[PDB]
Amino acid sequence: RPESELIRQSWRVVSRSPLEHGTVLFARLFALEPSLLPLFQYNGRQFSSPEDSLSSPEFLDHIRKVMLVIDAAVTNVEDLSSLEEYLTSLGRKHRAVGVRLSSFSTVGESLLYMLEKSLGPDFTPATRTAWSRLYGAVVQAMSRGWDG
Numbered sequence: 287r288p289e290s291e292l293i294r295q296s297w298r299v300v301s302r303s304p305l306e307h308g309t310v311l312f313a314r315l316f317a318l319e320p321s322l323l324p325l326f327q328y329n330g331r332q333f334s335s336p337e338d339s340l341s342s343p344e345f346l347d348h349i350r351k352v353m354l355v356i357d358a359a360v361t362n363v364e365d366l367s368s369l370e371e372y373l374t375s376l377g378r379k380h381r382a383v384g385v386r387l388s389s390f391s392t393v394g395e396s397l398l399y400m401l402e403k404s405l406g407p408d409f410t411p412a413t414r415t416a417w418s419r420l421y422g423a424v425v426q427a428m429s430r431g432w433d434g
């Protein structure tokens with residue numbers, strides 16, 4: 287505690303409808319950083335517009351994969367060292383597909399946006415601070431996949 291409990295309580299709301307909330311996360315992401323759009327290359331083709339991504343089964347499967355990684359982080363919030371090796375290889379995979387490490391800061395802001403809009407009154411400054419810390423720890427582990 288105390289960050290721990292704020293994370294578990296707030297995630298309970300989001301995890302009721304993961305694809306709907308993850309849709310908000312990625313809509314926001316492309317609004318902030320449109321140059322992330324070409325990195326989702328399924329069947330060797332590029333999405334033209336952000337709304338094109340929302341029709342792609344492969345893209346929606348990636349939303350589910352994202353939400354499952356965040357769920358594992360919440361389940362393990364008391365000790366994240368258990369996920370470190372997995373997160374390092376997840377970083378390496380994203381480096382491989384072309385994501386720059388700086389772009390994970392925009393992902394974090396999109397995550398915070400999605401929580402603010404979902405929780406409304408209930409997304410307190412303490413809750414924000416807890417999620418920033420948890421997300422920061424996840425990215426620090428992933429960052430090792432970009433060497434060092």
Ligand code: HEM
Nearest residue numbers: 322325326327344348351352355356379380383385389393
């Ligand atoms: C700008 C942000 C991101 C981009 C452009 C991106 C793109 C991709 C791409 C192209 C793949 C490979 C194809 C696929 O499996 O759908 C992938 C795999 C994956 N991504 Fe992401 N991703 C991003 C962020 C994230 C985040 C934040 C997470 C989790 C916290 C995540 C979790 C995954 C997982 C679990 C896989 C499967 C990895 C594997 O092969 O084992 N991604 N991502």
Ligand SMILES: [Ar]
Nearest residue numbers: 359420421424
């Ligand atoms: Ar997170």
